[PDB]
């Protein structure tokens, strides 16, 4: 039925959620999975949160992404309040009321990366490569592991995702086009698209490729 993870909470805040889950016999875990239904994010009073990996995966999975206030207010009324009333509205990066979480819940039949082939080309920091891959897969993309492995065809849309900061003395992210024919974009193309649950144009994310 229901299964929660939390994100952005202090070990303590996790303990109030833990008390809540225990009382109501709600599944609470530390790791997010396909079975997770709810991601409880720490927010400000207007339901705006920080962009964490769990936030991204929650939206990517079309889950309920709700404020910690759902828990505290529910306790305060000894009732079990409704998620809807506490859905996160935005985040500190992409907009205070972008309604990304609601859009993802409502767009599972038309995923933002449907019809795209994406290679997450390392290295990356703070986000394990296979989690970025899971994120895009949840979002409808086909994951490609090597540059030489993109499917060919006029109907295929390959995209290489990299995080330039992760490299150093390796202006090698400009030399990817020499190995394949696909636009090369920063990981922010993925992150912004997911948070907003709207596939962004590649333009502002594109990385120049040396001929």
């Amino acid at each position: 039925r229901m299964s929660m993870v939390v994100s952005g909470l202090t070990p303590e805040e996790f303990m109030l959620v833990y008390k809540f889950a225990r009382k109501h016999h709600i599944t609470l875990t530390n790791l997010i999975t396909e079975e997770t239904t709810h991601v409880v994010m720490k927010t400000d009073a207007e339901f705006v949160c920080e962009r964490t990996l769990k936030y991204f995966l929650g939206i990517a999975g079309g889950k309920w992404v709700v404020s910690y206030f759902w828990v505290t207010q529910s306790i305060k009324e000894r009732k079990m309040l409704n998620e809807h009333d506490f859905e996160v509205r935005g985040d500190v990066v992409n907009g205070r009321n972008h309604q990304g979480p609601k859009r993802a819940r409502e767009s599972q039949d038309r995923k933002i990366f449907r019809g795209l082939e994406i290679c997450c080309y390392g290295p990356f920091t703070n986000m394990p490569t296979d989690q970025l891959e899971w994120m895009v897969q949840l979002c409808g993309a086909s994951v490609v592991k090597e540059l030489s492995s993109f499917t060919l065809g006029t109907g295929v849309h390959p995209i290489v995702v990299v995080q330039p900061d992760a490299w150093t003395e390796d202006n090698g992210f400009h030399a990817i086009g020499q190995m394949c024919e696909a636009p090369v974009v920063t990981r922010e193309w993925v992150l912004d698209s997911v948070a907003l649950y709207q596939c962004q144009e590649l333009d502002t994310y594109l990385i120049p490729q040396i001929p």
């Binding site: 994100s7 952005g8 720490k42 962009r51 964490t52 769990k54 986000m127 922010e188």
Partner: peptide, 8 residues
């Protein structure tokens, strides 16, 4: 929390 955040 110990969880990384992703800002610009």
């Amino acid at each position: 929390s110990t969880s990384p955040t992703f800002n610009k």
